[PDB]
Amino acid sequence: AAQTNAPWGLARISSTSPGTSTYYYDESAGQGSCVYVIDTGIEASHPEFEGRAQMVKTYYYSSRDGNGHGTHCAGTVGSRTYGVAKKTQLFGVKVLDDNGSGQYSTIIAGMDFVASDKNNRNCPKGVVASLSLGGGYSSSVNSAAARLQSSGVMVAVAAGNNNADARNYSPASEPSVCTVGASDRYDRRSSFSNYGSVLDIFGPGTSILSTWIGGSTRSISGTSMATPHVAGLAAYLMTLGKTTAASACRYIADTANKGDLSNIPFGTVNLLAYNNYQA
Amino acid sequence: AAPA
Ligand SMILES: [Ca+2]
Q: Does a cis peptide bond (omega within 30 degrees of 0) precede residue A171?
A: yes
Chain A nearest C-alpha distance from B3 (Å): 4
- Give the number of residues written for chain A: 279
DSSP reduced 3-state for B3? strand
**Residues with C-beta atoms within 5 A of ion ligand 1:** A 175, 200
DSSP reduced 3-state for B4? coil
Task: State how beta strands A33-39 and A126-131 pair.
Answer: parallel
CATH superfamily of A1-279: Peptidase S8/S53 domain (3.40.50.200)
Q: Which residues contact B2 (CB under 8 A, 6 or more apart)?
A: A96, A100, A101, A102, A133, A134, A135
Q: Where do the domains of chain A lie?
A: 1-279
DSSP B2: E
This structure's resolution (angstroms)?
A: 2.2
Task: State how beta strands A208-212 and A201-204 pair.
Answer: unpaired
Distance A197 CA to ligand 1 centre (A): 9
End-to-end CA distance of chain A: 8
Distance separating alpha carbons of residues A56 and A174, to the nearest angstrom: 25
Question: A260 and A191 in contact (C-beta within 8 Å)?
Answer: no
Q: Which residues contact A145 (CB under 8 A, 6 or more apart)?
A: A111, A131, A155, A157, A171, A174, A176, A177
Question: A175 and A166 in contact (C-beta within 8 Å)?
Answer: no
Contact assignment for A224 to B3 by CB distance below 8 Å: yes
Among A259, A33, A17, CA closest to A127: A33
Contact assignment for A96 to B3 by CB distance below 8 Å: yes
- CB contacts of A222 in chain B (<8 Å) are 4
Distance separating alpha carbons of residues A140 and A277, to the nearest angstrom: 38
Number of alpha carbons in the 13 Å side-chain half-sphere of residue B1? 34
Contact assignment for B2 to A227 by CB distance below 8 Å: no
Task: Give the sheet arrangement for strand A169-170, strand by strand.
Answer: A169-170, A133-136, B2-3
- Give the count of beta carbons closer than 10 Å to the beta carbon of residue A151: 18
- Give the count of beta carbons closer than 10 Å to the beta carbon of residue A109: 16
DSSP B1: -
Beta bridge partners of A156: A130, A178
Residues of A serving a catalytic function are 39, 69, 224
Contact assignment for B4 to A135 by CB distance below 8 Å: no
Among A223, A121, A111, A126, CA closest to A176: A111
Distance separating alpha carbons of residues A253 and A74, to the nearest angstrom: 22
The gap from C-alpha A241 to its chain's centroid, in whole angstroms, comes to 19
Query: 3-class secondary structure for chain A?
Result: CEECCCCHHHHHHCCCCCCCCCEECCCCCCCCEEEEEEECCCCCCCHHHCCCEEEEEECCCCCCCCCCHHHHHHHHHHCCCCCCCCCCEEEEEECCCCCCCCCHHHHHHHHHHHHHHHHHCCCCCEEEEEECEEEECCHHHHHHHHHHHHCCCEEEEECCCCCCEHHHEECCCCCCCEEEEEECCCCEECCCCCECCCCCEEEECCCEEEEECCCEEEEECCHHHHHHHHHHHHHHHHHHCCCCCCCHHHHHHHCCEECCCECCCCCCCCEECCCCCCC
Technique used to solve these coordinates: X-ray
- Give the count of beta carbons closer than 10 Å to the beta carbon of residue A17: 9
- CB contacts of A180 in chain B (<8 Å) are none
